[PDB]
Design a binder for this molecule. Structure first.
Ligand SMILES: Cc1cc2c(cc1C)N1[C@H](O)C[C@H](c3c(F)c(F)c(F)c(F)c3F)[C@]13C(=O)NC(=O)N=C3N2C[C@H](O)[C@H](O)[C@H](O)COP(=O)(O)OP(=O)(O)OC[C@H]1O[C@@H](n2cnc3c(N)ncnc32)[C@H](O)[C@@H]1O
Length: 643
């Protein structure tokens, strides 16, 4: 599966054209299948070549000279394919040598708002497409939601930090380009309760098993019984979970009842049995006496005998059918069903798994769309998740190489007319001096959090379409902060990549719930998800770092946890250039909104385009998702202006 592998790594089916490829190649799709059979191969072969060496640019003639007979003969077809793959970022993207110099004459002027991974991606494309591009960044750096703390030998990511499986992941290519040092995450994750004592492997799995069961349940109700709407309002994942758990609690009490009923019943049957026994116990005194009292005694005590014995053939007899009761009685009162669904402690551990989810989605479960929260699930990449051992910032930096980025430039208004665009921005360091950049098209990679901001951070003239603003408002933009604790000593298990901390209450189940051991230097990361994420931003670094040490000193014991010589704390929600961590499908929305976002705004011809982790439906809230959305718009614009 050589050429079959390339197709896969590019999120493409090696044995069939996609709806898009069919749109650009109608002649092929609607023609001899033998031809379509050829198209694919060339496509899969071109990709193969590019992936087997993403360091250097794969030119048209470079591809045409590496194909074999008879493919290399159909030059025209090869070109159409090669060109296509290049125009849509499937080849020659990221950072690579340009064996063919860029045209001295840049055709088309486009302004890109934001120097994030999505912005830098599209930027390098449009530029390589021989087009004058300019990026306006508000921050004094690049990467946007990709930040990395670097001081001495210390390295830590305050933003992105994980690479979700290399299989099919575009970052796999970029990684190979920027020499990004990655490392798998050892699944071994020990949980420590409030006091500080670990959780026995038994429960750790007992609870986690239920966690999966409850989720599966919610999935059932949602995608099988269609329980996505209640009281005319959308149902949230958390909402559903609370209900499912509310049922398990019921069932538990139900069995507890039937059991108490069996008990009471057996007890009733006993008290009753003992009663007549005492009546027969008395019926014996009537015969064990009165005897030896009739000259025909030879037949008197003779008959009476089988009468007193017959009554004993009952008493000690009932003891038999009475024995089969003490057994059942003691047997039941010794095998009582689960007193409760989850103990006060069981719930605490389960909250860790929910908090762990509130971390993944970067928002409280009660705000997630029970039906669409996991809409992009069918697009995950195969392979183990990785961590950027050397700071995830090494990527956006390499991408900004050779680009015209103007840091310290906050865009405050975007003007798009039937012909031409104007992007008015101001210098952050000196809000007095403003700037006015003219262009043909504008690419807005602004975070959903900024677009939602009220009052608006940037002004759109004419005002953004109604179908757009509404989508922006319906979508959800989560939050998630970290606390980088820099030490000069590793007092924790060096083998364990991450360990968790269980909270005391459901409310604060996301407060420093997970610690990370990823970087070389003695550094740990504390995550604050869910409710805590936003709240914790109102607490000074001092107190925050304080609470952390406490947690640590409770796990590793005090006197073993030294004072951090360097500490970093994020507040993406407070960050004026972010206003949150990343998007998420909120109850009352869907992946459909992730397309309305991508939809360009047009007055007779598309002028304003959008990109970002909130515009790519199948790969939302991710570095690669943002990357792909970048390459996406890159081509979209290229067609609109270069054709
Ligand atoms: C916020 C955040 C986001 C992420 C994150 C952590 C945080 C705190 N890390 C976490 O480690 C776990 C997720 C994680 C996960 F999410 C998952 F889904 C998952 F499955 C996991 F397993 C994870 F581990 C993860 C990760 O580990 N792995 C991931 O793949 N993604 C992660 N994310 C999300 C990504 O950071 C995010 O998708 C990406 O950064 C998006 O990039 P972008 O689209 O270019 O957006 P941008 O903000 O970078 O760029 C906008 C630019 O515009 C500028 N700007 C602003 N305002 C103005 C003006 N007014 N004028 C001019 N300019 C301007 C801004 O300043 C920028 O320069």
């Amino acid at each position: 599966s050589g050429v079959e592998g390339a197709a896969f790594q590019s999120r493409l089916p090696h044995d069939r054209m996609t709806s898009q490829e069919a749109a650009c190649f109608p002649d092929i799709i609607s023609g001899p299948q033998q031809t379509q059979k050829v198209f694919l191969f060339i496509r899969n072969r071109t990709l193969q070549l590019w992936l087997d060496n993403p360091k250097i640019q794969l030119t048209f003639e470079a591809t045409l000279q590496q194909l074999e007979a008879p493919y290399n003969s159909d030059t025209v077809l090869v070109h159409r394919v090669h060109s296509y793959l290049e125009r849509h970022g499937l080849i020659n993207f990221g950072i690579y040598k340009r064996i063919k110099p860029l045209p001295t004459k840049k055709t088309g002027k486009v302004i890109i708002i934001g120097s994030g991974v999505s912005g830098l991606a599209a930027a390098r494309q449009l530029q390589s497409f021989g087009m004058d591009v300019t990026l306006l960044e508000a921050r004094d750096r690049v990467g946007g939601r990709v930040a990395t703390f670097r001081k001495g030998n210390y390295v830590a990511d305050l933003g992105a930090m994980v690479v979700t499986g290399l299989g099919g992941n575009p970052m796999a290519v970029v990684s190979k380009q920027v020499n990004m040092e990655l490392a798998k995450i050892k699944q071994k994750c020990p949980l420590y309760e409030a006091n500080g004592q670990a959780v026995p492997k038994e429960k750790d799995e007992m609870v986690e098993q239920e966690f999966n069961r409850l989720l599966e349940a919610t999935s059932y109700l949602s995608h099988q019984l269609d329980f996505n709407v209640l009281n005319n309002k959308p149902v949230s994942l958390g909402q559903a979970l609370e209900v499912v758990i509310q049922l398990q609690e019921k069932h538990v009490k139900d069995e507890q009842i039937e059991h108490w009923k069996k008990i009471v019943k057996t007890q009733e049957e006993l008290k009753e049995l003992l009663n007549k026994m005492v009546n027969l116990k008395e019926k014996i005194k009537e015969l064990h006496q009165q005897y030896k009292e009739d000259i025909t005694a030879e037949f008197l005590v003779k008959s009476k005998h089988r009468d007193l014995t017959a009554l004993c053939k009952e008493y000690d007899e009932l003891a038999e059918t009475q024995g089969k009761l003490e057994e059942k009685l003691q047997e039941l009162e010794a095998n009582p069903p689960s007193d409760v669904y989850l103990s006060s402690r069981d719930r605490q551990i389960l909250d860790w798994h929910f908090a762990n989810l509130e971390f993944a989605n970067a928002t409280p479960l009660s705000t997630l769309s029970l039906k669409h929260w996991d809409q992009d699930d069918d697009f995950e990449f195969t392979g183990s998740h990785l961590t950027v051992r050397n700071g995830y910032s090494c990527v956006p930096v390499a991408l900004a190489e050779g680009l015209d980025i103007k840091l310290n430039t906050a865009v405050r208004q975007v003007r798009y007319t039937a012909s031409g665009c104007e992007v008015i921005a101001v210098n952050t360091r000196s809000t007095s001096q403003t700037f006015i950049y003219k262009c043909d098209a504008v690419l807005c990679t602004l975070p959903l959090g900024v677009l939602k901001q009220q009052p608006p951070a940037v002004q759109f003239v004419p005002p953004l379409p109604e179908w757009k603003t509404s989508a922006v408002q319906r979508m959800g933009f989560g939050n998630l902060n970290k606390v980088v604790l820099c030490f000069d000593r590793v007092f924790w298990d060096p083998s364990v990549n991450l360990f968790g901390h269980v909270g005391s209450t459901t409310a604060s189940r996301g407060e420093l719930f997970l610690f990370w051991n990823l970087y070389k230097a003695p550094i740990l990361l504390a995550l604050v998800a869910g409710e805590a994420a936003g709240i914790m931003e109102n607490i000074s670094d001092d107190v925050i770092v304080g609470r952390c040490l406490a947690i640590l000193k409770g796990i590793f014991g005090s006197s073993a946890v030294p004072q951090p010589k360097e500490t970093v704390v994020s507040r993406w929600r407070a960050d004026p250039w972010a206003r949150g961590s990343y998007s998420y499908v909120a109850a009352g929305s869907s992946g459909n909104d992730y397309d309305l976002m991508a939809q360009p705004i047009t007055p007779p011809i598309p002028r304003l385009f959008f990109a970002g982790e909130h515009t790519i439906r199948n790969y939302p809230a991710t570095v690669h998702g943002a990357l792909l959305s970048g390459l996406r718009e890159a081509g979209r614009i290229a067609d609109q202006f270069l054709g």
